[PDB]
Amino acid sequence: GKRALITGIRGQDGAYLAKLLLEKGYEVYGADRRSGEFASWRLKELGIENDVKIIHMDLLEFSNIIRTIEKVQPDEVYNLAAQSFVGVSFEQPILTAEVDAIGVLRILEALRTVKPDTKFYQASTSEMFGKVQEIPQTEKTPFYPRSPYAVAKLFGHWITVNYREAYNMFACSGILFNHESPLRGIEFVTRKITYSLARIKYGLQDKLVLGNLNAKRDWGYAPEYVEAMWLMMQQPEPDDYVIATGETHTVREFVEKAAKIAGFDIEWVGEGINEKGIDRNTGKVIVEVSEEFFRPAEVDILVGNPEKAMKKLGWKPRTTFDELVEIMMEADLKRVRD
Amino acid sequence: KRALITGIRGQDGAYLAKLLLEKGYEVYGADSWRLKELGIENDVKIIHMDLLEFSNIIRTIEKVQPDEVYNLAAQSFVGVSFEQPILTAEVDAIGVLRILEALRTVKPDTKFYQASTSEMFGKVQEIPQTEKTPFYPRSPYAVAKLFGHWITVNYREAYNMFACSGILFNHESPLRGIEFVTRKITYSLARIKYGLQDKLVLGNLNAKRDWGYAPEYVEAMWLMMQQPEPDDYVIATGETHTVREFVEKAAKIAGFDIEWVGEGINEKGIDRNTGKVIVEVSEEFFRPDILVGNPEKAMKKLGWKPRTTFDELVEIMMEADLKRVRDREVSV
Amino acid sequence: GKRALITGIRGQDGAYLAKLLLEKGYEVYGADRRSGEFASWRLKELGIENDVKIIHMDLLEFSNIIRTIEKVQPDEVYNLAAQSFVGVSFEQPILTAEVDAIGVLRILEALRTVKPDTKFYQASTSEMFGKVQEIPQTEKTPFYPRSPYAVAKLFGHWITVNYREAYNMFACSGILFNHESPLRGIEFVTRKITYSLARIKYGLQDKLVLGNLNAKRDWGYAPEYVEAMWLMMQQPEPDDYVIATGETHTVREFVEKAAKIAGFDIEWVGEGINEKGIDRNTGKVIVEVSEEFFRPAEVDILVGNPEKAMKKLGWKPRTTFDELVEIMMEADLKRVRD
Amino acid sequence: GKRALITGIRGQDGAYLAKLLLEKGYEVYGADSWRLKELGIENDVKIIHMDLLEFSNIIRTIEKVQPDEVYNLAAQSFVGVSFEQPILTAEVDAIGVLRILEALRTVKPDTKFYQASTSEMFGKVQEIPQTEKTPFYPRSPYAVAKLFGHWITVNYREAYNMFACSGILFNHESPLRGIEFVTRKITYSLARIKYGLQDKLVLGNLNAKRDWGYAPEYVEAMWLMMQQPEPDDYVIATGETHTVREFVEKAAKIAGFDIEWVGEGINEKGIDRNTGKVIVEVSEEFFRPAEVDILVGNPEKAMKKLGWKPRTTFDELVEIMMEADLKRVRDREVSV
Ligand SMILES: NC(=O)C1=CN([C@@H]2O[C@H](COP(=O)(O)OP(=O)(O)OC[C@H]3O[C@@H](n4cnc5c(N)ncnc54)[C@H](OP(=O)(O)O)[C@@H]3O)[C@@H](O)[C@H]2O)C=CC1
Ligand SMILES: NC(=O)C1=CN([C@@H]2O[C@H](COP(=O)(O)OP(=O)(O)OC[C@H]3O[C@@H](n4cnc5c(N)ncnc54)[C@H](OP(=O)(O)O)[C@@H]3O)[C@@H](O)[C@H]2O)C=CC1
Ligand SMILES: Nc1nc2c(ncn2[C@@H]2O[C@H](COP(=O)(O)OP(=O)(O)O)[C@@H](O)[C@H]2O)c(=O)[nH]1
Ligand SMILES: Nc1nc2c(ncn2[C@@H]2O[C@H](COP(=O)(O)OP(=O)(O)O)[C@@H](O)[C@H]2O)c(=O)[nH]1
After folding, report:
1. DSSP 3-state assignment of D269?
2. Mutational pocket test of ligand 1: of A29, A32, A43, A100, the residue with most ligand atoms within 8 Å of the beta carbon
3. How far, rounded to the nearest angstrom, does the alpha carbon of residue C10 sit from its chain's CA centroid?
4. Are residues D192 and D331 in the same domain?
5. What is the DSSP letter of D136?
6. Which are the contacts of A115, defined by CB distance < 8 A and separation ≥ 6?
7. Nearest CA-CA partner of D96 in B99, B53, B98, B97
8. How many domains does chain C have?
9. Which of A93, A265, B115, C14 is most exposed, with the fewest beta carbons within 10 Å of its own?
10. Residue D128 carries which DSSP code?
């Protein structure tokens, strides 16, 4: 059937998207920087590791990209590959830009000269809003990036927009708010929390060390968000969509709710760098704060309004935040048991 | 104090070099008819630097130890940016970050100016445009410059570096490149005056622009850099003129009295003095979004405002090209 | 004690090296591009995942490298990070050179400016000998690289030599021949073979598809090879050393021997692209040959002579090819059995 | 009319090669000059933007030009600079080569490619004389980067059957040679001493041995390599060394000096037999002890397979350079 090429195929979103596209009767081709016996762990969990054709394509290598497009002749390209860690982007800003900004343009150029009727999805992000200029944020909210990651992703957004407008290419920018699942990488706050709490329960770790507990995020369920990616690519005309839950919670709340499911009754004492999460049952400190996990420039709050995606795509979130936290904690408890 | 200027060979690099030398700076230019024209070619120290590669930038910074860096170097053509978007991004976006990251690594106390542009506003989201107007870039050039603007902001905010982004609207001078419409107009009219050319071919004469005088804009760049705290400013006149107005005013200096006949692609300019049809509109250039800056913040905070008027600007450019064309293409 | 910085810390050699250095009383710091919950799988197997401090350092980011040397202040640096896949190097030659050639020079420049008395080890390779000019190959054998990987590594070798000679820096180039272990990545032929056979035995996989079965390699045991890295770094003078077993076998032999341990009795039928490995017991095809796994320019044979390393370092190979095959096959049988 | 793309068009070799190719009816594109102006070809060469530091602009350039032949002569070519800027040197002299090869592979793999390699790759010479089969031993980041250039070109040839040649050229000189080089220093300085503008020529070890050829003949070897049925690599050299002393003395004779050499090593001096004045001396700033590493190329393979050999003798070479510099100093630094 339709051929899809998914960059970042072995990431959270690449895996769920591949599963969805396989169900829709696609041939799925994927490129990723993750190699080795455990790289396809996410595809293995979904039972699709035999059904995806992995090819070598690096966002930094224009000629490799050109060849890949020439060889695959994709009907749809989902650019999900990125250096996606915000904290690391301050340490490696140039590499971050080359992958997250210029790599988008390398794909667009390869498509323009090799197969211009190809549909293109760019994995944009609520991180682009940074120091939010409106609350809630919509497609019309002015951007204010606060990390090299966010600045590079903003280039990726605007270059996608420009190829759509200037070349009449079918190019969509998905402005997705934080979305999570049991496949979320442990580098990220939500999975860091559940993975750590599970290990703390089974005595494999002493404490959970975090940065900014006051940070507020709109957190959704990734399987639903990749559905949104597919849906916008099926519209007769290309456009950009905010995909979000419309609901915001602190990192603190995530920890409390997760920890409850893990059997800890958290109380907070102290303030700022000195704040601690204590299991009320035992008086033990479970959660601590370290300046190491704070970003040089922080993003205090994100909350999206996905009204446009409801009206044009019929997309709406289904999984509640409380459901999300359970899903994640339960999966990680099981993992640490096994 | 030592200043390092990228794009030293351009309109703005040359005028800025002039101004800084007058202020007693040692001036280093990263790599000139413009510097010769200004008589400063032996007063500027030229050094190699390439925005395409990182290690040479580090070395340049270590060698020069600049107090101020002005990043004026750019692939600055919009049409070229559609043909070569990646090269454009490497120079106009990543090259900015390369300089910032070099300063961060070896000389973080250095002041940094980024040469941003009203092209970042693109499909304008407010009229007039201020520092708070949302951006809407419409070319790979404008997209790359937007990255340059935001990355400068981020280095300021993340590291408390002295990093300023100047959002400059169109500025012109006798040193303006012939590639640009203002020079095209003044240069063509002088050639027409001396019978070396028959007509000037242009786009939509209704098109509006905020045109200032380049030497006053490089002054705003320096002023931004002398403030106690770094910030970003819109630098502009805050008034638009049509291409038609520019042409008429330039024509008058050349001895023409233009009567306009027709509309849109049909519009032509006929000299009342001779009856010659000297201006025409082309399908090539004709296009059926008012870019105009509100520079009040620059006035309030820097005490900067335009001094040279539009009429004066046009006169300055016309008198220079009338003289150039005389000297180069007309018998004594 | 002494501080060591190991790039590529989560790969086979980085893992084993970290273990050795910890046993020698070092503080061990590591940078690696592999992240997430299964990135430290090798360090987890060796029981050292809590004794290694992982820092972010990418060989593509000069300023990140500089900052890392500044923070760590290492006494010894082992540059084990690489795009180390030969087949992929033909598809991504520039990225390969940027990591494997220029990355070496980036580290050396950082050391020269931050901490010039740091001892430096470069992970060079028998692959540099390519179309071999002498047999066996020694430190004095003229190079003849046959892939962009090998050309890049050759630059890495010569730039290390040059920094030693021109700056009197303690810089060593280890010319290590192929070395393997149960921690070897599945992208490489040996582990591909053992991993695939275990899965075939258990009906997780149908066939093992390989390329050039005629290729001859000198295959050693990785733990013994990282010992040699440390040994060269402890010598009065810096120098370069071939580390090898001196014994050469075909890929075909590797397959035969591994399959036997797994319970297959392999018969080879056909020739070239049509050659197939049949289980004499069942008549089923276990092994087949695909054009896709052949390299554009091949390395027909590598075999080293490590007599300088014996004479100068007291280093000798202890584990035989036959022992290595058993070690690898046994671990992969166990893994699939769980 | 075949199309040639030359990188490093502004150099000694770029200019002479452009001249030769035009003479052979090529359309010549130079990637970006007093040298081109001197040759009278400044208006016959199409100058285009290309930068070896970045990949996408190379691809576009190849697509636009559609060259039949690419000659990569662009380099950061200074050894001293290479120690100061080793990374930039490698980006231009190593990775830049791969960028061009990878661009041809992607959009025009039938294009012939010449890589400008160098005797500096031999460095600490592993044989004397050196041939295509002599093992390399680079001794600077310039030489290490150039070594990458050579081998990546070999690999593209072998891996993809691309027409890719690496010319291992020993020192070659001409009136177009830059002043930073000892041959021009000698000839330029001696022309200035003749006309009273300078007192002395100050050098290093006069016993220093070099293989010096005539640049136009060397670019001819480049073209010849590219015209063979099969691509291959060649040492292009004279096969004979002369001393710095021999260069100076022959040069001096052309300038009107009759040089007697008095002393040894750092204390050696050139004295004019006619006046008794010290014309030449050796300084500690330039002096290096006896060189064990004699760079001298055996070009027998080039003769056997290309029919290439040097035609301009050493004496002819020195004369050519000295006559050009005498004329230049007369035209520009002394009154009529
Ligand atoms: N998850 C979220 O809540 C949101 C994420 N985003 C974006 O969504 C996308 C996917 O998210 P997620 O699944 O969490 O990301 P992951 O980090 O889990 O996956 C990204 C993948 O990209 C690969 N990659 C990195 N660099 C390159 C490159 N040079 N060439 C090819 N592949 C490369 C990585 O490989 P390797 O593991 O080897 O490094 C990794 O597998 C990313 O673009 C991210 O920035 C945007 C909005 C919300
Ligand atoms: N093993 C052998 O038989 C021989 C190996 N070699 C060399 O020895 C070294 C180590 O071998 P081995 O352990 O098998 O190699 P591995 O591939 O297993 O490990 C190399 C590591 O380097 C990391 N890496 C890749 N690119 C970068 C970069 N951009 N910056 C920082 N880190 C990066 C990889 O991370 P990620 O997983 O995310 O890609 C990977 O974990 C390599 O240099 C290899 O080329 C030489 C001779 C013999
Ligand atoms: N990654 C990470 N984030 C943390 C941590 N502690 C607090 N945070 C905050 O949680 C928020 C979400 O971070 P993350 O999950 O990494 O995704 P982000 O939106 O890309 O920053 C940010 O504001 C972080 O500053 C931590 O230990 N790791
Ligand atoms: N990687 C790999 N190598 C193979 C395969 N089949 C045969 N080989 C050969 O096995 C030899 C060793 O390859 P590898 O383990 O990848 O290490 P190498 O020496 O770096 O190429 C090479 O000559 C390969 O061509 C295969 O399926 N994968």
Report:
1. strand
2. A32
3. 12
4. yes
5. P
6. A69, A73, A74
7. B53
8. 2
9. A265
10. S
Cα D184 to Cα C105: distance, rounded to the nearest angstrom: 33
**C283 with C199: CB under 8 angstroms?**
no
Runs of H (alpha helix) within chain D: 12-23, 34-38, 55-65, 79-84, 86-90, 96-107, 141-160, 182-194, 215-226, 244-255, 300-306, 314-332
Helix axes B11-22, B214-226, angle to 10 degrees: 60
Q: How far D231 CA lies from chain C's nearest CA (Å)?
A: 16
Same domain, A315 and A325: no
Which subunits sit against A, judged by 3+ Cβ pairs under 8 A? B, C, D
Between CA B29 and CA B114 the distance in angstroms is 15
CATH number, position C234: 3.40.50.720
CATH classification of the domain holding A326: 3.90.25.10
Q: Residue B241 phi/psi, 5° resolution?
A: -130, 155
Regarding whether B150 and B77 lie in a shared domain, the answer is yes
Establish, for the pair of chains A and C, how many residue pairs have beta carbons separated by less than 8 Å. 54
- Resolution in angstroms, to 1 decimal, for this deposition? 2.0
Domain shared by D133 and D208, yes or no: no
Q: Are residues C88 and C47 in the same domain?
A: yes
Residue range of the domain that includes B259? 177-211+240-287+309-332
A76 in Cβ contact with A6 (< 8 Å): no
Q: Which residue's CA is the nearest one to ligand 3's atom 12? A: A189
Tokens coding B157: 């905010």
Q: Which residues line ligand 2 (CB under 6 A)?
A: C 7-8, 10-14, 32-34, 58-60, 80-84, 99, 123, 125, 176, 178-179, 185
C127 is a catalytic site residue: yes
Give the amino acid at A171.
Answer: A
| Cα-based distances in Å from A22 to A25, A51, A80, D109 | 5, 8, 17, 37
- Verify that B126 and B207 share a domain, yes or no: no
Q: What is the DSSP string of D172-200?
A: EE-TTS-TTSHHHHHHHHHHHHHTTS-S-
d(CA B165, CA B152): 7
Q: Which of B224, B119, B232, B227 is nearest to B171 (CA)?
A: B119
Question: Are residues B115 and B190 located together in one domain of the fold?
Answer: no
Q: Take residue C250 and report the two structure tokens written for it.
A: 């075909």
Same domain, C67 and C96: yes
Three-state secondary structure string covering chain A? CCEEEEECCCCHHHHHHHHHHHHCCCEEEEECCCCCCCCCHHHHHCCCCCCEEECCCCCCCHHHHHHHHHHHCCCEEEECCCCCCHHHHCCCHHHHHHHHHHHHHHHHHHHHHHCCCCEEEEEEEHHHHCCCCCCCECCCCCCCCCCHHHHHHHHHHHHHHHHHHHHCCCEEEEEECCEECCCCCCCCHHHHHHHHHHHHHCCCCCCEEECCCCCEECCEEHHHHHHHHHHHHCCCCCCCEEECCCCCEEHHHHHHHHHHHCCCCEEEECCHHHCEEEECCCCCEEEEECHHHCCCCCCCECCECCHHHHHHHCCCCCCCHHHHHHHHHHHHHHHHHC
Say which experimental method was used: X-ray
State yes or no: D198 annotated in a binding site. no
Length of chain A: 338
- For residue B35, give the nearest of B46, B24, B26 by alpha carbon: B46
Q: Which run of H or E residues covers position D164?
A: strand D164-169
CA distance D23 to C93: 37
Distance between CA atoms of C195 and C191, rounded to whole angstroms?
6
Do the strands A276-279 and A266-269 form a parallel or antiparallel pair, or are they unpaired? antiparallel
Rounded to whole angstroms, the Cα distance separating A64 from A61 reads 5
On whether any CB of chain D is under 8 Å from the CB of B52, the answer is yes
Q: Residues of B with CB below 8 A from A92's CB?
A: none
